[PDB]
Scaffold this active site. Structure first.
Site, short mmCIF file in Angstrom:
data_model
loop_
_atom_site.label_atom_id
_atom_site.label_comp_id
_atom_site.label_asym_id
_atom_site.label_seq_id
_atom_site.Cartn_x
_atom_site.Cartn_y
_atom_site.Cartn_z
N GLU A 128 38.79 -65.71 8.96
CA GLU A 128 39.43 -64.38 9.27
C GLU A 128 40.91 -64.50 9.75
O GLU A 128 41.32 -63.56 10.47
CB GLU A 128 38.50 -63.90 10.38
CG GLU A 128 37.09 -63.31 10.10
CD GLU A 128 36.33 -62.85 11.20
OE1 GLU A 128 36.71 -62.31 12.21
OE2 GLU A 128 35.07 -62.69 11.01
N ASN A 170 36.73 -69.05 5.64
CA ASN A 170 35.65 -68.04 5.56
C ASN A 170 36.34 -66.74 5.95
O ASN A 170 37.09 -66.67 6.91
CB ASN A 170 34.59 -68.60 6.79
CG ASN A 170 33.63 -67.76 6.56
OD1 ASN A 170 32.67 -67.33 5.75
ND2 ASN A 170 33.13 -67.07 7.76
N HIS A 207 29.48 -59.25 4.43
CA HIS A 207 28.70 -57.94 5.31
C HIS A 207 28.95 -56.64 4.55
O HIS A 207 29.84 -55.90 4.61
CB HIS A 207 29.34 -57.90 6.66
CG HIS A 207 29.29 -58.96 7.64
ND1 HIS A 207 28.02 -59.63 7.90
CD2 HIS A 207 30.22 -59.92 7.81
CE1 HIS A 207 28.22 -60.50 8.73
NE2 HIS A 207 29.35 -60.87 8.84
N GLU A 236 27.36 -64.77 5.50
CA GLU A 236 26.63 -64.21 6.61
C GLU A 236 26.22 -62.97 5.98
O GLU A 236 26.39 -61.89 6.44
CB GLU A 236 28.12 -63.74 7.50
CG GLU A 236 28.55 -64.96 8.33
CD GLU A 236 29.75 -64.73 9.18
OE1 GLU A 236 29.77 -63.61 9.76
OE2 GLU A 236 30.76 -65.56 9.59
N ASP A 238 24.29 -59.59 5.39
CA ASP A 238 23.37 -58.62 5.57
C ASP A 238 23.89 -57.14 4.85
O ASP A 238 25.05 -57.09 4.48
CB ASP A 238 23.65 -58.61 7.06
CG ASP A 238 25.05 -58.47 7.81
OD1 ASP A 238 25.95 -57.84 7.21
OD2 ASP A 238 24.86 -58.96 8.94
#
Length: 302
Positions: A128, A170, A207, A236, A238
């Protein structure tokens, strides 16, 4: 055809993983479903900076090793998350700047990777680092204020500590090919390859929600990064509301790209999610399979 997610992914030489939290390991529904369905694990919190080095030079691997040991005992590989990040720093590190911070960052990487040398297949080395919005700038943090080279230094340090691990960058909001954040990440990876900075993989957090929706051009993003000479991974995943169609599309995008290693979903049941109110995962709260589970399994099986 195979009847579980991990086994179905393995037929294409890929994996299907989840995030595991140590506080949930006494729940027998959670452990038996996670044990059956997934072949890759990420620790949700236990390998972050605050959890592993609570005081400078004093490492604590108790909770991290609980997750690692559970994974290996249940036949899974492990992704390490995460070595250098602006968030969840222990108080002692928040107080450091400049050269003192740089040495503490290096010491932290070396200490954690030494404990797991040869045991962890991928590491999220840096997490990030880019800002959200239209600028493509770096995010403000003590790490970034130490100099633009902080990211390269973290990667060079990690390569020397464990040459067997794949080293990933990432981030989130980097899935749509047309976004400024995506293009800032692309230019960084291209520069690193030209100059010999070790980077083996890019992780797309994935995400997806109303403010950051899936776009069909995700396949273009994955292909264009792979062409730079890196593997790509969905780290990750979702999706708000868990729509079957979107879950199948993301799965097919990875299967269409030769260097897409696999997919990790960010939890087991909806109630285990960091965003449980958005019901964004593949299993209901009682452990039953949702419509999206069937869509993913069918895509993996062809």
């Amino acid at each position: 055809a195979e009847s579980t997610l991990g086994a179905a992914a393995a037929q294409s030489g890929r994996y299907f993983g989840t995030a595991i939290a140590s506080g949930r390991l006494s729940d027998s529904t959670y452990t038996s479903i996670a044990g059956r369905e997934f072949n890759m694990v990420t620790a949700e919190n236990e390998m972050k900076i605050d959890a592993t080095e609570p005081q400078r030079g004093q490492f604590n691997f108790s909770s991290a090793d609980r997750v690692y040991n559970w994974a290996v005992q249940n036949g899974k590989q492990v992704r390490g998350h995460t070595l250098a990040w602006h968030s969840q720093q222990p108080g002692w590190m928040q107080s450091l700047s400049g050269s003192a911070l740089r040495q503490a960052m290096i010491d932290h990487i070396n200490g954690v990777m030494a404990h797991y040398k040869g045991k962890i297949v991928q590491w999220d080395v840096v997490n990030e680092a880019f800002a959200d919005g239209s600028s493509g700038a770096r995010r403000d943090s003590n790490l970034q204020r130490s100099g633009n080279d902080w990211i390269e230094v973290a990667f060079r340090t990690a390569r020397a500590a464990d040459p067997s691990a794949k080293l990933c960058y990432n981030d989130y909001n980097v899935e749509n090919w047309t976004w400024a954040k995506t293009q800032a990440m692309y230019n960084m990876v291209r520069d690193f390859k030209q100059r010999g900075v070790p980077i083996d993989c890019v992780g797309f957090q994935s995400h997806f929600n109303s403010g950051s929706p899936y776009n069909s051009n995700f396949r273009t993003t994955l292909q264009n990064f792979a062409a730079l000479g890196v593997d790509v991974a969905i780290t990750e995943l979702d999706i708000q509301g868990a729509p079957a169609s979107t879950y199948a599309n993301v799965t097919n995008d990875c299967l269409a790209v030769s260097r897409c290693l696999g997919i990790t979903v960010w939890g087991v049941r909806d109630s285990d999610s960091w965003r449980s109110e958005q019901t964004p995962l593949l299993f209901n709260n009682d452990g039953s399979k949702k419509a999206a589970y069937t869509a993913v399994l069918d895509a993996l099986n062809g």
